[PDB]
């Protein structure tokens, strides 16, 4: 297929493996998650603008809004984590091993 789809999919997989291999922070995880959402926005947008399918032009906006609301939820979760340990470190979230 088209050559720009290669780069947008590979960007999605780069941000996937960033979101699938944490270092320390939960904020860097949410950044990788929203990079995944951004790459989905770009890819759905390039398809819908390519094929001239008119009614799906409202589709990525929806894909923005919900997922941006999703990001808000995650940020609040992070803040509750940072209201317990003082950092947003993912290694402090191990109380449920037992």
């Amino acid at each position: 297929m088209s050559l720009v789809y290669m780069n947008i999919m590979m960007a999605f997989t780069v941000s996937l493996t960033g979101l699938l291999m944490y270092r320390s922070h939960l904020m860097s995880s949410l950044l990788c998650l929203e990079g995944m959402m951004l790459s989905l926005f770009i890819l759905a947008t390039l398809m819908i603008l390519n094929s001239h399918f008119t009614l799906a032009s409202m589709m990525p906006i929806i894909l923005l809004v919900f997922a941006a609301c999703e990001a808000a939820l995650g940020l609040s979760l992070l803040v509750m984590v940072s209201n317990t340990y003082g950092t947003d470190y993912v290694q402090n979230l191990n109380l449920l091993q037992c």
């Binding site: 297929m1 088209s2 050559l3 720009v4 789809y5 290669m6 780069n7 947008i8 999919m9 590979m10 960007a11 780069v14 941000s15 493996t17 960033g18 979101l19 944490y22 270092r23 922070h25 904020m27 860097s28 950044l31 990788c32 929203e34 990079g35 951004l38 790459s39 926005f41 770009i42 947008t45 390039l46 819908i48 603008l49 390519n50 001239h52 399918f53 008119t54 009614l55 799906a56 032009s57 409202m58 990525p60 906006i61 929806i62 923005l64 809004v65 919900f66 941006a68 609301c69 990001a71 808000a72 939820l73 940020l75 609040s76 979760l77 992070l78 803040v79 509750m80 950092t87 947003d88």
Partner: protein, 169 residues
Amino acid sequence: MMTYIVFILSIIFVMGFVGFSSKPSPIYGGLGLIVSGGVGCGIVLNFGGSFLGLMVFLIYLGGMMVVFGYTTAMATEQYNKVVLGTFITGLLMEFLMVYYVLKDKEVEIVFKFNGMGDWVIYDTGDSGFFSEEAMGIAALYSYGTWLVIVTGWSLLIGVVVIMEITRGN
């Protein structure tokens, strides 16, 4: 060179994601995702999606990454080998992809991809006195009734959920 410009922007786009997928710090991660959003917006603008690209600016960057940098600046009190190694790893993977698809005009990582510039796939007609993208977004209120109901209900519930889980009571 200029006929490949979206491709070139897309390369910067992939580079921008390695700017934060290696996760140097969440503030440098935020900066990398801002530059990535700008170039991906430019990619959206070059297929004719002006309104969608300005949603990437107004809502993704100027709306949401503002809140990411805001929340991050309220943490990570102000003052790597793995970061730079993973960064050059992803960069060399992407430039090997560039070199392969520019020397072969064909590549297959998971799907087959053409090596010519993406100007070839476009349409050769006009849309008259409307942008088809603008009218498909204007269709959200006439044809998109159920979508507006469920989206507005999810945003109202989102406000309620954010107020519940941050109260602590």
